[PDB]
Design an enzyme around this catalytic site. Structure first.
Site, mmCIF file in Angstrom:
data_model
loop_
_atom_site.group_PDB
_atom_site.id
_atom_site.type_symbol
_atom_site.label_atom_id
_atom_site.label_comp_id
_atom_site.label_asym_id
_atom_site.label_seq_id
_atom_site.Cartn_x
_atom_site.Cartn_y
_atom_site.Cartn_z
ATOM 1 N N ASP A 25 0.832 -1.343 0.007
ATOM 2 C CA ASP A 25 0.008 0.212 0.109
ATOM 3 C C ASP A 25 0.660 1.150 0.008
ATOM 4 O O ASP A 25 1.327 1.888 1.021
ATOM 5 C CB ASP A 25 -1.034 0.082 1.369
ATOM 6 C CG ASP A 25 -2.126 0.770 1.224
ATOM 7 O OD1 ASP A 25 -1.953 1.826 0.568
ATOM 8 O OD2 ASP A 25 -2.979 0.705 1.988
ATOM 9 N N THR A 26 1.150 1.716 -1.052
ATOM 10 C CA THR A 26 1.785 3.200 -1.269
ATOM 11 C C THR A 26 1.189 4.489 -0.690
ATOM 12 O O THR A 26 1.793 5.247 -0.617
ATOM 13 C CB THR A 26 2.091 3.496 -2.970
ATOM 14 O OG1 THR A 26 1.022 3.422 -3.541
ATOM 15 C CG2 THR A 26 3.074 2.217 -3.414
ATOM 16 N N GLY A 27 -0.329 4.296 -0.426
ATOM 17 C CA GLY A 27 -0.695 5.247 0.267
ATOM 18 C C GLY A 27 -0.695 5.274 1.800
ATOM 19 O O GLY A 27 -1.307 6.143 2.331
HETATM 20 C C1 LIG Z 1 -6.966 11.572 8.241
HETATM 21 O O1 LIG Z 1 -5.940 10.587 7.330
HETATM 22 C C2 LIG Z 1 -5.057 11.353 7.053
HETATM 23 C C3 LIG Z 1 -4.941 12.730 6.913
HETATM 24 C C4 LIG Z 1 -3.865 13.494 6.266
HETATM 25 C C5 LIG Z 1 -2.867 12.837 5.876
HETATM 26 C C6 LIG Z 1 -2.766 10.983 5.805
HETATM 27 C C7 LIG Z 1 -1.767 9.967 5.506
HETATM 28 C C8 LIG Z 1 -2.536 8.921 6.041
HETATM 29 C C9 LIG Z 1 -2.080 7.629 5.930
HETATM 30 O O2 LIG Z 1 -1.025 7.203 5.394
HETATM 31 N N1 LIG Z 1 -2.988 6.569 6.298
HETATM 32 C C10 LIG Z 1 -3.009 5.407 6.198
HETATM 33 C C11 LIG Z 1 -4.204 4.814 5.419
HETATM 34 O O3 LIG Z 1 -5.216 4.361 5.962
HETATM 35 N N2 LIG Z 1 -3.862 4.993 3.972
HETATM 36 C C12 LIG Z 1 -4.906 4.898 2.937
HETATM 37 C C13 LIG Z 1 -5.036 5.935 1.991
HETATM 38 C C14 LIG Z 1 -5.382 7.154 2.663
HETATM 39 C C15 LIG Z 1 -4.549 8.312 2.974
HETATM 40 C C16 LIG Z 1 -4.756 9.349 3.285
HETATM 41 C C17 LIG Z 1 -5.835 9.720 3.929
HETATM 42 C C18 LIG Z 1 -6.962 8.646 3.805
HETATM 43 C C19 LIG Z 1 -6.750 7.411 3.311
HETATM 44 C C20 LIG Z 1 -4.517 3.401 2.287
HETATM 45 O O4 LIG Z 1 -3.402 3.890 1.250
HETATM 46 C C21 LIG Z 1 -5.608 2.652 1.617
HETATM 47 O O5 LIG Z 1 -5.911 3.294 0.432
HETATM 48 N N3 LIG Z 1 -6.436 1.999 2.160
HETATM 49 C C22 LIG Z 1 -5.894 1.478 3.782
HETATM 50 S S1 LIG Z 1 -7.231 0.604 4.239
HETATM 51 C C23 LIG Z 1 -7.629 -0.011 2.633
HETATM 52 C C24 LIG Z 1 -6.807 -1.066 2.134
HETATM 53 C C25 LIG Z 1 -9.242 -0.550 2.489
HETATM 54 C C26 LIG Z 1 -7.592 1.217 1.820
HETATM 55 C C27 LIG Z 1 -8.640 2.338 1.850
HETATM 56 O O6 LIG Z 1 -8.696 3.421 2.642
HETATM 57 N N4 LIG Z 1 -9.612 2.131 0.819
HETATM 58 C C28 LIG Z 1 -10.846 2.974 0.669
HETATM 59 C C29 LIG Z 1 -11.001 3.421 -0.770
HETATM 60 C C30 LIG Z 1 -10.315 4.557 -1.295
HETATM 61 C C31 LIG Z 1 -9.511 5.235 -0.485
HETATM 62 C C32 LIG Z 1 -10.759 4.954 -2.654
HETATM 63 C C33 LIG Z 1 -11.731 4.281 -3.261
HETATM 64 C C34 LIG Z 1 -12.359 3.324 -2.879
HETATM 65 C C35 LIG Z 1 -12.314 2.591 -1.468
HETATM 66 C C36 LIG Z 1 -12.560 1.483 -0.986
HETATM 67 C C37 LIG Z 1 -2.661 4.491 7.622
HETATM 68 C C38 LIG Z 1 -2.798 3.126 7.248
HETATM 69 C C39 LIG Z 1 -1.236 2.715 7.726
HETATM 70 O O7 LIG Z 1 -0.475 3.908 7.677
HETATM 71 C C40 LIG Z 1 -1.488 4.854 8.209
HETATM 72 O O8 LIG Z 1 -3.659 9.211 6.723
HETATM 73 C C41 LIG Z 1 -3.648 10.602 6.537
#
Ligand SMILES: COc1cccc2cc(C(=O)N[C@H](C(=O)N[C@@H](Cc3ccccc3)[C@H](O)C(=O)N3CSC(C)(C)[C@H]3C(=O)NCc3c(C)cccc3C)[C@H]3CCOC3)oc12
EC number: 3.4.23.16
Lengths: 99, 99
Positions: A25-27
């Site tokens: 997960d690069t996000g």
């Molecule tokens: C309030 O939150 C944030 C605020 C500001 C900056 C950041 C940076 C991060 C971050 O890196 N958050 C990570 C994260 O959850 N990142 C997720 C993306 C994200 C980044 C910033 C803000 C919010 C989300 C992840 O890459 C993803 O896609 N995940 C992790 S859980 C998952 C595998 C189900 C999936 C998801 O959320 N998917 C939902 C989803 C999206 C995003 C788009 C379209 C469809 C769906 C189903 C967690 C997990 C471990 O490290 C910390 O959060 C932030």
């Protein structure tokens, strides 16, 4: 390997002697795994994602293998919906995005 | 390009006539952008991850430019904390994870 993105980039990891499935997960800044027992002391952290925040336990210097590649680094444990390998460990295994 | 993972992999996108910064996110199935107008019909959707679910609007067949590379696909709009380019569009620009 070269991992395409037509499907979720799921791999097998090894942690605590056990194999688990996890998402590359690069996000994700961090690595967070579902409830399990890890050795040592932990520190508190909150992590914030698409829905809001969860509380997790931060364990440092944990031995973990990711798709056969050895890493030693920080692993968070808590009520994540899937096991997530984030950038702290992706960088240890030399992963890049390419297009 | 080759994008390392020492910091968040943020790029410039053009969507709906607007420039935005967005995260190249292999952990995201979908693409979700902060509130903005888009043309055409939409339907509601719930998307979930760390911290749970949010409600978004789903727009189909939306042209986008991601770091100079054009594509088309579904774009979700709603209260995401970060603009996220997920796998549905990463595939189309030819992005892979390599290690
Ligand atoms: C309030 O939150 C944030 C605020 C500001 C900056 C950041 C940076 C991060 C971050 O890196 N958050 C990570 C994260 O959850 N990142 C997720 C993306 C994200 C980044 C910033 C803000 C919010 C989300 C992840 O890459 C993803 O896609 N995940 C992790 S859980 C998952 C595998 C189900 C999936 C998801 O959320 N998917 C939902 C989803 C999206 C995003 C788009 C379209 C469809 C769906 C189903 C967690 C997990 C471990 O490290 C910390 O959060 C932030």
């Amino acid at each position: 390997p070269q991992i395409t993105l037509w499907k979720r980039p799921l791999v097998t990891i090894k942690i605590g002697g056990q194999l688990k499935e996890a998402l590359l997960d690069t996000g994700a800044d961090d690595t967070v795994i579902e409830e399990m027992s890890l050795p040592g002391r932990w520190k508190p952290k909150m992590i914030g994602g698409i829905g809001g925040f969860i509380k997790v336990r931060q364990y440092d210097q944990i031995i973990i293998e990711i798709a056969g590649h050895k890493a030693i680094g920080t692993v968070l444990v808590g009520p994540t919906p899937v096991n997530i390998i984030g950038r702290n460990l992706l960088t240890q295994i030399g992963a890049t995005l390419n297009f």
